[PDB]
Design a protein around this ligand. Structure first.
Ligand SMILES: *Cc1cc(C*)cc(C*)c1
Ligand SMILES: [Cl-]
Ligand SMILES: [Cl-]
Lengths: 17, 245
């Protein structure tokens, strides 16, 4: 997963979606 | 930043390092930004959309390391956090990915130029460098897409502007690329922005001036063939910038 400490959570590369 | 070189803030002295304070008082990095006037840093709305409350953010100028302090840095609170009311992101692209942070030190002051801190100029309306022009990007973002850690020292690299024509090809981005964007990449596809670099500057010499042509916004993967970095196109956002600033 990915938590609230994640750097640039919606950046390119991110596991967001 | 994929590829490129380690640098120091003196070589990119408009770069802003933006952090978020947590519930317990831990602080983590968020995104980059650029100092466009003494009291104002410009960045990307996507960096803030999930946590839009100005009070959680800290901005450093004159800072060359991610998790350590460096000589000549200055620390600011965020007095106003201005997000684009039209931000949208489909699955890949982010639209209106632009944000403004009005900065203020605990003594109530804005930035002062120094060896490590300077403003960067905006382009005049609709004025962008010719395609194929070499520009710079900088940031604390990942050195490889597959990395879990971030570099401790600031990095910069060089990428070239690509045309919308080129950037709109189904094997590139198609219409995913609006005229409020700009594509840039390495001719050899070896260097690029990556996660953690968002919000940071795309700097180009334009009519004799170091100019913030773009803001790191989005792309497919990092340093992939036919997949340039996409930037918020600053020349097309002046009225928003003036009215909010
Ligand atoms: C896990 C996570 C975190 C953020 C900020 C955004 C998305 C999509 C996912
Ligand atoms: Cl905490
Ligand atoms: Cl707005």
């Amino acid at each position: 997963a990915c938590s609230r400490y994640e750097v640039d959570c919606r950046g390119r590369x991110s596991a967001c979606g | 930043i994929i590829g490129g070189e380690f640098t120091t803030i003196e070589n990119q002295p408009w770069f802003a390092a933006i952090y978020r304070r947590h519930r317990g008082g831990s602080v983590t990095y968020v995104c980059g930004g650029s100092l466009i006037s003494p009291c104002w840093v410009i960045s990307a709305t996507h960096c803030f959309i999930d946590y839009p409350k100005k009070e959680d953010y800290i901005v450093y100028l004159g800072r060359s390391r991610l998790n350590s302090n460096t000589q000549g840095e200055m620390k600011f609170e965020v007095e106003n956090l201005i997000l684009h009311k039209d931000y949208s992101a489909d699955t890949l692209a982010h639209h209106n990915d632009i944000a403004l942070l009005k900065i203020r030190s605990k003594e109530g002051r804005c930035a002062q130029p120094s060896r490590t801190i300077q403003t960067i100029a905006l382009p005049s309306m609709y004025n962008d460098p010719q395609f194929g022009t070499s520009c710079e990007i900088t940031g604390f973002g990942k050195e490889q897409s597959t990395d879990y850690l971030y570099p401790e020292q600031l990095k910069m690299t060089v990428v070239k502007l690509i045309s919308h024509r080129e950037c709109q090809q189904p094997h590139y981005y198609g219409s995913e690329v609006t005229t409020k964007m700009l594509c840039a990449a390495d001719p050899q596809w070896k260097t690029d922005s990556c996660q953690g670099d968002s919000g940071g500057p795309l700097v180009c010499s334009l009519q004799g001036r170091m100019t913030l042509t773009g803001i790191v916004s989005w792309g497919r993967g990092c340093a992939l063939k036919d997949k340039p970095g996409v930037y918020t196109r600053v020349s097309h956002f002046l009225p928003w910038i003036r009215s909010h600033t």
